[PDB]
């Protein structure tokens, strides 16, 4: 469902900001997760350009000047 699919994302920041913040932060803490900030919510939380729209070019050259 749209709640269990949005809580099962690979990003603990967006899942913790959606709902069930305690469960998400607990499983992410004991699993030692790492959030690469690839979606829109995680770049909104952290005050960045979103990877969509006019921030799509910025993220592309952020990832091709990191994979090089």
């Amino acid at each position: 469902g749209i709640t269990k699919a949005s809580l099962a994302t690979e990003s603990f920041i967006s899942a913790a900001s959606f709902q069930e913040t305690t469960r998400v932060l607990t499983e992410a803490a004991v699993a030692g997760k790492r959030d690469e900030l690839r979606g829109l919510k995680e770049n909104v939380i952290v005050g960045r350009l979103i990877p969509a729209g006019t921030g799509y070019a910025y993220h592309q050259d952020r990832m091709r000047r990191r994979a090089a």
């Binding site: 749209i2 709640t3 699919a5 949005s6 967006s14 913790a16 900001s17 959606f18 913040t21 305690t22 919510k41 909104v44 939380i45 729209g53 006019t54």
Partner: protein, 552 residues
């Protein structure tokens, strides 16, 4: 932190941290005294429950409350919930360069512009005015400029008129259910305190002018200004993203004016003349020599796109009305005359705008939509289209339809007394013969409403579609359904109990007649149910939209 009256305000975390420290220091003390171990175990349990209340208050046991009998806000409550860090401070914020006011209508505006009060703009654009006052030498210092803007000298209004010039503002109406709830507009400085919204964008905002407020936001950077101009401007937002239908579309007054203009009367003044073009039709209408509905013969030149992008003309005498020829003057060139040679309701105008968009593109379409709005407003004004009590024409045979259904319900009641039917089929028969009588009253009312202009053509009577105002508002799609004309002029019909089960005696009255006390009470039964649904389903729809956004 000290409050204004010398009192202090504190966080609940200080209470929780103090409790943890106090129980920890007492545990250290007891371990120094070598207390009996029942006392040390108790202090360890208390330190554990204090640390638990600090981290998450209320998971294990009862929530610790402090000095209100209100539970203390723990560290976990700071970051979770609708009022946690994430949802209240990180996923949405309160912003600077933002104002708010009641919206009014400006029907003179162009689609890309809003009306912004000068008092609001002088505050929202204040560092821009400071910069342009220091730059133009009118102020020696940002404090001199600040005092100029406080005194509101005559030159800060010129500075303000040049700082807002090509600078869009975002206008937002809550709830922002979709992305057309934020649109960018070029401001026109007005003298009121109310924002003037273009009519054609109200359906995108779900806004009416009965007390709605909208927020204004100023894009600060050049990138934000160019996104407001290139992505969010209302002239980019004429199609819906949910479905490719036009969302900046005429409504209410515009479609009533365009419908009244494009209708035809049988013996209207100036019928049967032959006109050299739409300009002659406008001359004859304005000089009072022909009626807007006079069916007439006009030489119309219409352009069509060939296989190439070229626009080739054809000229012919069309059998049209004066008002359709007048409306043809605002239609862009690549469109056919059949797009206006009919009475234009809401659907026809929406399809006309969609046709203009697919054939000619966005620049002719925004000009066309503005011209359509101006023309529909003008000719709804010219019409004098009022609503009176004699417009709710009740069918003359409604009383006998109700008497016949009453006779049928009486004979079914006597059949139930005579044991021919049980209560179930008896009740269902009553419901059926009242729904049938309601459909009979509705058909009689609509038949007496929709064509009852009888009109003389060279002496002979003829039926035409009705120029009744209630009917014209319903038929144009401006306001009103047939289901509501039924309640005005027919009967209100069967009502449901709060259980959902139908009350077996309907409202045989309409709103033109009165409802009596009992009819009105059993109508409020369902009026409140609908209002409570509206009040309680916004939370469910917002929760579903939030789950959908967060999954996608």
């Amino acid at each position: 932190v000290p409050l204004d009256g010398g009192r202090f305000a504190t966080s609940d975390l200080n209470d929780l941290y103090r409790r943890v420290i106090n129980r920890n220091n007492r545990l250290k003390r007891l371990l120094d005294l070598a207390a009996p171990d029942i006392i040390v175990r108790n202090e360890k349990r208390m330190l554990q429950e204090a640390v638990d209340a600090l981290l998450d208050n209320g998971r294990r046991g009862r929530a610790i409350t402090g000095s209100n009998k209100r539970p203390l806000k723990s560290l976990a409550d700071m970051i979770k919930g609708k009022q946690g860090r994430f949802r209240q401070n990180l996923l949405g914020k309160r912003v600077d360069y933002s104002g708010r006011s009641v919206i009014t209508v400006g029907p003179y505006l162009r689609l890309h512009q809003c009306g912004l009060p000068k008092k609001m703009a002088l505050e929202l654009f204040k560092p821009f005015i400071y910069g342009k006052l220091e730059l133009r030498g009118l102020a020696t210092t940002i404090k001199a400029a600040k005092k100029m803007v406080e005194r509101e000298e005559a030159v800060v209004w010129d500075i303000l008129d040049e700082v807002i010039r090509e600078h869009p503002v975002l206008l937002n109406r809550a709830p922002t259910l979709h992305r057309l709830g934020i649109q960018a507009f070029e401001p026109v400085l007005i003298e009121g305190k109310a924002i003037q919204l273009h009519p054609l964008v109200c359906a995108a905002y779900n806004a009416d002018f009965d007390g709605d407020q909208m927020a204004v936001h100023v894009p600060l950077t050049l990138e934000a200004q160019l996104e407001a101009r290139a992505l969010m401007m209302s002239t980019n937002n004429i199609l819906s993203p949910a479905n490719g239908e036009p969302i900046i579309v005429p409504s209410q007054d515009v479609v009533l004016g365009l419908y009244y203009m494009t209708r035809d009367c049988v013996n209207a003044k100036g019928e049967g003349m032959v006109l050299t073009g739409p300009k002659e039709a406008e001359r004859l209408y304005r000089s009072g020599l022909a009626s807007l509905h006079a069916r007439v013969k006009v030489r119309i030149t219409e352009y069509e796109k060939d296989a190439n992008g070229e626009l080739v003309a054809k000229t012919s005498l069309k059998d049209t009305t004066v008002g359709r020829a007048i409306l043809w003057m605002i239609v862009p060139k690549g469109l056919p005359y059949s797009i206006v040679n009919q009475a234009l309701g809401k659907k026809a105008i929406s399809k006309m705008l969609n046709t203009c968009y697919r054939i000619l593109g966005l620049k002719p379409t925004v000009i066309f939509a503005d011209q359509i709005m101006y023309t529909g407003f003008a000719y709804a004004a010219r019409s004098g289209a009022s609503v009176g009590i004699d417009d709710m024409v009740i069918p003359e045979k409604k009383h006998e339809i109700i008497s016949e259904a009453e006779a049928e319900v009486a004979e079914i009641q006597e059949q139930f007394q005579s044991g021919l039917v049980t209560a179930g089929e008896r009740y269902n028969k009553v419901i059926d013969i009242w729904a049938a009588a309601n459909d009979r009253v509705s058909k009689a009312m609509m038949d007496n409403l929709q064509t009852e202009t009888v009109i003389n053509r060279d002496g002979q009577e003829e039926k035409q579609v009705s120029f009744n105002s209630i009917y014209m508002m319903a038929d144009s799609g401006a306001r009103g359904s047939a289901a509501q004309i039924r309640q005005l002029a027919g009967m209100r019909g069967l009502m449901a109990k709060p259980d959902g089960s139908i009350i077996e005696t309907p409202i045989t009255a309409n709103f033109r007649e009165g409802l009596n006390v009992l009819q009105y009470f059993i109508s409020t039964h369902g009026a409140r149910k609908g209002l409570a649904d509206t009040a309680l389903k916004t939370a469910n729809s917002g929760y579903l939209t939030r789950r959908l956004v967060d999954v996608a």
